[PDB]
Amino acid sequence: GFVGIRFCQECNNMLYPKEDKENRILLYACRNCDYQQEADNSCIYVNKITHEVDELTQIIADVSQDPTLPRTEDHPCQKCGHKEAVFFQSHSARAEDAMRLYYVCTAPHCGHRWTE
């Protein structure tokens, strides 16, 4: 789980958290405005030391139409089942230690991505 910023309703600004000492609940107040709203996530901050980020969430379907990217026929897609497919490394800095590939289907209207 994570936590997202929730803007105010009137002034549209950052809402800081607040622990209601009276009702013993979690609130989000506004620095300028006096807006209040009862919380639901019951979380404030989370830190990912390992930074276990799913590279698949960053990959996009447009990478398929790349003329300088390798292609293989031995890793067909799952949904559509097309043969042609591309593969490449994380291509992201701060790579811990892994060249695990990220296969992407090479066909319109699919944009599927997987890993083996």
């Binding site: 996009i60 447009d62 990478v63 139409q65 790349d66 990217l69 291509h91």
Partner: protein
């Protein structure tokens, strides 16, 4: 050593051109201008940069880039010195037209066969 350099026999430097025809040509197409555009519509789109100026936003790079390439190949609205870069990983089309962009001529290869035929 290493600081002084010499151009190659084929190396050619762009003399420089104007961005107005390109701006007009991109404006005629379905390109929403950057001044009036919903900020939420920037995620699923590609940002166009001309001479380092972020202007306009498009929703179909695979076709826009092909149109630009064909147009430059025909030498009618865009001079041969202009260069359109296609960034796949992040949707950004950065075009440059100022001088000093060292370049060279290269043959074109459509699928597996060149266009420089016997004719």
């Amino acid at each position: 050593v290493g600081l002084v350099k010499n151009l190659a026999l084929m190396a050619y430097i762009s003399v420089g051109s104007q961005p107005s025809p390109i701006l007009e040509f991109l404006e005629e197409w379905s390109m929403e201008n950057l001044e009036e555009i919903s900020p939420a519509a920037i995620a699923d789109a590609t940002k166009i940069f001309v001479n380092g100026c972020w202007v306009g936003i498009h929703k179909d790079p695979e076709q826009l880039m092909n149109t630009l390439r064909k147009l430059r190949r025909q030498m009618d609205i865009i001079v041969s010195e202009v260069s359109m870069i296609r960034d796949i990983r992040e949707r950004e089309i950065r075009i440059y037209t100022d001088a000093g962009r060292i370049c060279r001529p290269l043959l074109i290869v459509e699928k597996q066969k060149l266009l420089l035929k016997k004719r």
